[PDB]
């Protein structure tokens, strides 16, 4: 709530992401279902996962250098994994961390590029952690630049890093405050259409047999879905995905945010807009921790800290450190 890029929006953003990670992790890889479960939330018994672990490292690097520093951030990613390897990291990305831990590795972008036979990862790990980029940078141009660079430390495929940019742009727009769902989507579609005109993105999509301009095509499908009668969970998953690939989860999280901007008679009205967004996201199944962490980052930025329920927040491991980091970003980079 309040002004664009307010303290409340910064706090709400990281808290919403933490809630999505911790609450979503219950159902990892799997709606009356979910409603029963969240009743348990009415201390810090819900562990966070790699989503939050990497988001913390990304934010701590930004705060330490008051800028993006690829060497500092890569080493904080690698040291965070060394300290706590069991947070549920992707099977592939652990190879990047182990190469970065070698002090002879002096070009910190090359391990990511070697992944998957030199094509790079298209997993959603670059996007799951990216919200802090949009807290640190107000400009659309800087958000894209550093969403891409931060993502490329582990995700060198355009499918991976453009998913991170798209998620960062969504958080960026949510921090600006009230919007129609149609305007919000149209802004994202315009940005992705511009990025997916790049020859590198066209090649990656072609070689995987995908639609030309894959994120753009899925954002167009979101627009159609938002106009469709009686949309079911199966239909959402069939059109957008609920998977570990960035292209099968970042649009899905954005859809969850946009859909839940209005009340849903199937979710009890006692839940606020942030809560109903998280509940709806988790009800899609699949990679629930990451889809919920990304939808929650967007919704938290949009609705603000006043919609973060204390009962839910205080169930989450590290919620106080998360909140302090949000306040530090607002001080150091928003210069409040
Ligand atoms: N180019 C590719 N070709 C084939 N498979 C791939 C490719 N890229 C990714 N994969 C598959 O995608 C997997 C993960 O890619 P990873 O780069 O390890 O890590 P992440 O951080 O993105 O993890 C993605 C999510 O998975 C968990 O839920 C985590 O919590 C994340 O939310 C690989 O092991 C491959 O099977
Ligand atoms: Ca996770
Ligand atoms: Ca995940």
Numbering used by the authors: 14 to 43, 48 to 59, 70 to 363
Q: What wording appears in the published article?
A:
To test this model and dissect the structural basis for the inhibitory effect of Ca2+, we determined the structure of full-length ARH3 in complex with ADPR and Ca2+ at a resolution of 1.75 Å. Two metal ions (CaA and CaB) and ADPR are positioned in a way similar to those found in the Mg2+-bound form. Unlike the Mg2+-bound form where both Mg2+ ions have a similar octahedral coordination geometry with six ligands, the coordination architecture of CaA and CaB shows a notable difference. CaB is coordinated with a total of seven ligands with an average metal–ligand distance of 2.49 Å. With respect to the Mg2+-bound form, the 1″-OH group is rotated ∼10° in the Ca2+-bound form. As a result, the 1″-OH group is directly coordinated to CaB, whereas 2″-OH bridges the dimetallic center by interacting with both Ca2+ ions. Notably, the metal-bridging water (μ-aqua) is missing in the Ca2+-bound form. Taken together, our findings suggest that the distorted di-Ca2+ metal center and the tilted conformation of 1″-OH, a position for the scissile O-linkage in substrates, are likely to interfere with a precise alignment of substrates for nucleophilic attack, resulting in suppression of enzymatic activities of ARH3.
While coordination of two magnesium ions (MgA and MgB) significantly enhances its catalytic efficiency, calcium binding suppresses its function. In the active site of ARH3, acidic residues, including Asp77, Asp78, Asp314, and Asp316, maintain the integrity of the bimetallic center and render the ideal alignment of the substrate for catalysis.
